[PDB]
């Protein structure tokens, strides 16, 4: 008779899980903002009559 | 009497759950716009005045 708990604390503190799925960090870039703009510059078109 | 080593038990090696804040953030601002089309001006020799 004498000794008590053997300081054997064993339950995991906060249950591991170092996982960063999917989003993780900065997954594939968001949308590529389309760039419209002027088209074929016909400046000074054909000569009329 | 008090038996030693009764399994003190506890939370050894505290931990931390997973996570992943990588999720899509801010993409590029509006793509380069413009005025597509007849990017030109009056043509060539025409009805004189």
Cβ contacts (< 8 Å) between B7 and chain A: which residues? 5-6, 8, 10
Residue written as token pair 């400046």: A43
User: Would you say B31 and A30 are in contact if contact means Cβ atoms under 8 Å apart?
Assistant: no
* Residues, chain A: 49
Backbone angles phi, psi at B47, to 5 degrees: -50, 110
Residue written as token pair 């793509």: B31
C-beta atoms of A4 and B6 within 8 A: yes
Resolution in units of Å: 9.8
Sequence-ordered alpha helix ranges (H) in B1-49: none
Experimental method for this entry?
A: cryo-EM
Measured at the CA of A48, the angle between CA A44 and CA A49, to 5 degrees, comes to 155
User: Would you say A38 and B38 are in contact if contact means Cβ atoms under 8 Å apart?
Assistant: no
Cβ contacts (< 8 Å) between B49 and chain A: which residues? none
User: Would you say B41 and A46 are in contact if contact means Cβ atoms under 8 Å apart?
Assistant: no
């Amino acid at each position: 008779g004498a000794p008590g708990a053997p300081g054997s604390q064993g339950a995991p503190g906060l249950q591991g899980a170092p996982g960063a799925p999917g989003s993780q960090g900065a997954p594939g870039l968001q949308g590529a903002p389309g760039a419209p703009g002027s088209q074929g510059a016909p400046g000074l078109q054909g000569a009329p009559g």
